[PDB]
Amino acid sequence: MYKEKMPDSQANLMDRLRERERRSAALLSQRQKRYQQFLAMKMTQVFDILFSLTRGQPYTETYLSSLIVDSLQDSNNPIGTKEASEILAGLQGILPMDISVHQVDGGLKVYRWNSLDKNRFSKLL
């Protein structure tokens, strides 16, 4: 309601918006960092899809990212297609030992994972 009746501040109101302005950059980076943590944690419940029912290796990343979505993530917390690409692209980076994907002519192709202890490497987060 009409709560802001008497905030009779001095000329510090200019300094008031410095706090609004000068600190907003760090919070935006933190929100960016949270999404990275948001993505870097979802991959834990993603590689179980790969480990469970795919052992042949004709799959390109376009098909798999279209199956990261419309999948177990199609739940109380859906995920985006471009995020799914970021999810699948992060797997090689976080696990270089078992995944080595290279550009073929256009796009990426995904091969049969060698696989290990599926989630012990999450300590890198």
Partner 1 sequence: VKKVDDVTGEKVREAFEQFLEDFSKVYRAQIEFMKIYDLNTIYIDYQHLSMRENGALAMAISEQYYRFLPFLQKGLRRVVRKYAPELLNTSERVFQISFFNLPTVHRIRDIRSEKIGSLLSISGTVTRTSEVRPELYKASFTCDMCRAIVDNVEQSFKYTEPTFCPNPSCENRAFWTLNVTRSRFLDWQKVRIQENANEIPTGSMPRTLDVILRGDSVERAKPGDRCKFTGVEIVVPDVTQLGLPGVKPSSTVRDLTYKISFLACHVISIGDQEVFLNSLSSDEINELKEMVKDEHIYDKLVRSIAPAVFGHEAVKKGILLQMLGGVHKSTVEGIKLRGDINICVVGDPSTSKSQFLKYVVGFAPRSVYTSGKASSAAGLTAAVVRDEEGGDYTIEAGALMLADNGICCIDEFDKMDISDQVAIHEAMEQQTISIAKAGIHATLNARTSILAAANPVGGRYNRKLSLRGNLNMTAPIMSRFDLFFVILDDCNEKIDTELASHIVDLHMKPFSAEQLRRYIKYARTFKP
Partner 2 sequence: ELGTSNLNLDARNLLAYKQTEDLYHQLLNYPQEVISIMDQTIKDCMVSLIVDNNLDYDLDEIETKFYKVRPYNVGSCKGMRELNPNDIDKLINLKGLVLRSTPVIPDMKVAFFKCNVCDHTMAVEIDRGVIQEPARCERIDCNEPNSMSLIHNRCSFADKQVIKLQETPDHSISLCVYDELVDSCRAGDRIEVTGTFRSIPYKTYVDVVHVKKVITDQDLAKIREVAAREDLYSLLARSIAPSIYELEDVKKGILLQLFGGTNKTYRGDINILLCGDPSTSKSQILQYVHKITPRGVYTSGKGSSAVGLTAYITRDVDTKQLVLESGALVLSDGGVCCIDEFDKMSDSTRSVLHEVMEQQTISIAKAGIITTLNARSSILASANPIGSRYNPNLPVTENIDLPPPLLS
Positions that interact with partner 1 (CB under 8 A)? 31, 34-35, 37-38, 41, 45-46, 48-49, 51-53, 55-56, 67, 70-72, 74-80, 83, 117-118
Dist. CA 105–CA 86, nearest whole Å: 20
Query: What is the C-alpha to C-alpha distance for residues 35 and 44, in angstroms, rounded to an integer?
Result: 15
Residue 119 to residues 7, 18, 20, Cα–Cα distance (Å): 53, 44, 40
Q: Which two tokens stand for residue 11?
A: 């000329």
The string of DSSP letters for 98-125 reads T----B-SSSBB-------SSSGGGGG-
Q: Which is nearer to partner 2, 31 or 55 (CB)?
A: 55
118 binds, among partner 2, partner 1, none (CB under 5 to 8 A by kind): partner 1
- For residue 114, give both structure tokens: 């060698």
Task: Tell me how many residues contact partner 2 (CB under 8 A).
Answer: 4
Please identify, using beta-carbon distances, which residue of 58 and 93 lies nearer to partner 2: 58
Question: Please, which of residues 58-77 interact with partner 2 by CB under 8 A?
Answer: 58
Of the pair 109, 118, the CB lying nearest partner 2 is at: 109
Site for partner 2, rule CB under 8 A: 57-58, 109, 111
